[PDB]
Amino acid sequence: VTLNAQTIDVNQETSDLDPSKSVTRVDDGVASFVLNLPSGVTVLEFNVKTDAPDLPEENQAREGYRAIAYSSLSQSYLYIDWTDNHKALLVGEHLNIIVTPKSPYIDKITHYNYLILSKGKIIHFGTREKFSDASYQSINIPVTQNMVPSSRLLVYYIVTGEQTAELVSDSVWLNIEEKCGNQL
Amino acid sequence: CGAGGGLNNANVFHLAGLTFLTNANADDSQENDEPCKEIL
Amino acid sequence: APLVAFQPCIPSKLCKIEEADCKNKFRCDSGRCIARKLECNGENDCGD
Amino acid sequence: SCEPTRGCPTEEGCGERFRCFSGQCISKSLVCNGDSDCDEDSADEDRC
Amino acid sequence: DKEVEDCVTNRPCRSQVRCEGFVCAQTGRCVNRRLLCNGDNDCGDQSDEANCRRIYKKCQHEMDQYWGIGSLASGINLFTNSFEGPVLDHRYYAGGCS
Amino acid sequence: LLEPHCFPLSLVPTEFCPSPPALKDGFVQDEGTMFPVGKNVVYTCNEG
Amino acid sequence: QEQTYVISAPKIFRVGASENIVIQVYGYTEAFDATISIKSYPDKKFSYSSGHVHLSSENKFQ
Numbered sequence: 001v002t003l004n005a006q007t008i009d010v011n012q013e014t015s016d017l018d019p020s021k022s023v024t025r026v027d028d029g030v031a032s033f034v035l036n037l038p039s040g041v042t043v044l045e046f047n048v049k050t051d052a053p054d055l056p057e058e059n060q061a062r063e064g065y066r067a068i069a070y071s072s073l074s075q076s077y078l079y080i081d082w083t084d085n086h087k088a089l090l091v092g093e094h095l096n097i098i099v100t101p102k103s104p105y106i107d108k109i110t111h112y113n114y115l116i117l118s119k120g121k122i123i124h125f126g127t128r129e130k131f132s133d134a135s136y137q138s139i140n141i142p143v144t145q146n147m148v149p150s151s152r153l154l155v156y157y158i159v160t161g162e163q164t165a166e167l168v169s170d171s172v173w174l175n176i177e178e179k180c181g182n183q184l
Numbered sequence: 185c186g187a188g189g190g191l192n193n194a195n196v197f198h199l200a201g202l203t204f205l206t207n208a209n210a211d212d213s214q215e216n217d218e219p220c221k222e223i224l
Numbered sequence: 225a226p227l228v229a230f231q232p233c234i235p236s237k238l239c240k241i242e243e244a245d246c247k248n249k250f251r252c253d254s255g256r257c258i259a260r261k262l263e264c265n266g267e268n269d270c271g272d
Numbered sequence: 273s274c275e276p277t278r279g280c281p282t283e284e285g286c287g288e289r290f291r292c293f294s295g296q297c298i299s300k301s302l303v304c305n306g307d308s309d310c311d312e313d314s315a316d317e318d319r320c
Numbered sequence: 321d322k323e324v325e326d327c328v329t330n331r332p333c334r335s336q337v338r339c340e341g342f343v344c345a346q347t348g349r350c351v352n353r354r355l356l357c358n359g360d361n362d363c364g365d366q367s368d369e370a371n372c373r374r375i376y377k378k379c380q381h382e383m384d385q386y387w388g389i390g391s392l393a394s395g396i397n398l399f400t401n402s403f404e405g406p407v408l409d410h411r412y413y414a415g416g417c418s
Numbered sequence: 419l420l421e422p423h424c425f426p427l428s429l430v431p432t433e434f435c436p437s438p439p440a441l442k443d444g445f446v447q448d449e450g451t452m453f454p455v456g457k458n459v460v461y462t463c464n465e466g
Numbered sequence: 467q468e469q470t471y472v473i474s475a476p477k478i479f480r481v482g483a484s485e486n487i488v489i490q491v492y493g494y495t496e497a498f499d500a501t502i503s504i505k506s507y508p509d510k511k512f513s514y515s516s517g518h519v520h521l522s523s524e525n526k527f528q
């Protein structure tokens with residue numbers, strides 16, 4: 001499998017990553033990549049094609065996709081630092097996700113907050129606070145039994161400008177080990 | 185529906201299966217989803 | 225002493241007003257369905 | 273001075289509607305309409 | 321009408337009321353971030369329009385200031401009945417262009 | 419009744435049920451110092 | 467707008483389903499309380515459930 005990636009800047013500038021290649025895995029089906037991106041990136045349009053040499057390339061199957069920045073009117077953002085790791089977190093282990101409130105207004109952001117859905121319902125909630133080092137506490141809490149089929153973590157803060165204010169948010173799917181509380 | 189993130193603040197919550205009430209300038213009443221097919 | 229009064233109040237039924245499909249007439253952004261002949265008219269027949 | 277059992281009311285924005293710098297609310301069909309639809313601060317005309 | 325001197329005291333001070341938008345480097349004004357690169361001088365000394373990766377204009381035509389509108393911008397000594405000097409920035413347009 | 423938060427509130431109740439009746443071989447799944455008018459409780463019968 | 471809130475809830479409440487409904491507030495330096503409630507519609511005069519949550523510096527307004 002091989003990939004093409006036309007990033008677009010904050011301004012007119014269109015910039016292409018070098019074309020990349022990998023194989024779909026044998027036990028997982030996944031072909032996985034990681035793209036570096038411009039610090040100004042507004043969007044990416046990317047294409048993927050099957051690079052299998054047996055294909056006459058005009059019948060070689062391909063797909064095109066588009067990916068977008070989180071579109072803060074106030075240009076205030078919230079990023080979950082998670083690499084989308086495929087292996088599930090083991091029951092009762094501490095979660096180890098860092099978070100960054102990237103914002104023009106961070107002196108107003110004392111804290112950020114988070115929620116965990118499992119199946120349909122919120123099963124945990126909490127708050128995370130600013131260090132003197134100007135980073136913020138990580139999402140540490142143990143992967144309790146209420147999460148185990150799978151779970152979703154959502155994160156937010158609200159910040160003021162001078163006179164606007166904006167909800168600022170991110171979310172990540174967390175894969176959790178298929179192990180029960182009855183332990184049967 | 186889907187693995188995470190969103191187009192905007194309201195759409196993060198909406199894609200995450202939440203909804204919300206806020207005075208901080210958003211409302212996911214703006215939004216709908218299709219019959220979902222985003223396999224994770 | 226003003227001749228009418230209105231009090232803010234809780235509903236007790238759904239609103240039953242329809243949207244207009246208007247049989248291929250051209251629905252302007254403020255909701256007027258102008259005549260289909262006027263699509264790409266020139267001038268401005270919607271106001272909108 | 274007085275310690276109130278009364279809350280200060282919060283103040284509330286626009287949801288599906290666009291919001292100007294003042295806090296007034298305006299339709300999204302009036303963003304980049306090129307008139308000044310926001311009465312004073314024309315945030316509907318910013319960086320289009 | 322005055323005399324003033326420097327000091328050596330060490331009492332705490334909370335003078336850092338946050339400029340949330342952008343500090344106007346010369347004037348010490350703050351301006352909201354939608355006004356940077358609006359094609360207009362919101363800082364007084366043109367600071368806000370530095371390093372604009374693009375500029376966006378708003379006013380489609382030339383537009384006069386209303387006459388004397390910068391004169392009204394100044395406060396009065398109510399007792400001499402005189403304008404004394406400048407208090408509100410009647411060259412500030414916040415987007416505007418209506 | 420429409421817009422309560424504009425007014426003062428005693429948001430802490432001052433009208434209550436007495437504590438719910440017990441049951442043979444079961445208990446009130448909820449517990450507290452008082453139950454305000456129109457607050458629910460649910461029962462669960464004990465093991466077996 | 468110095469003072470703000472979010473309530474969050476599932477996109478759909480399930481009937482008989484002990485829904486866990488979260489509030490946060492901001493721009494506050496004083497504690498207060500709130501009766502988050504599920505009520506009759508359209509008529510807003512009956513309550514299917516309520517909870518008098520306390521919002522305080524202890525819980526960082528959550």
Ligand SMILES: [Ca+2]
Pocket residue numbers: 355356357358359360361362363368369
């Ligand atoms: Ca400017």
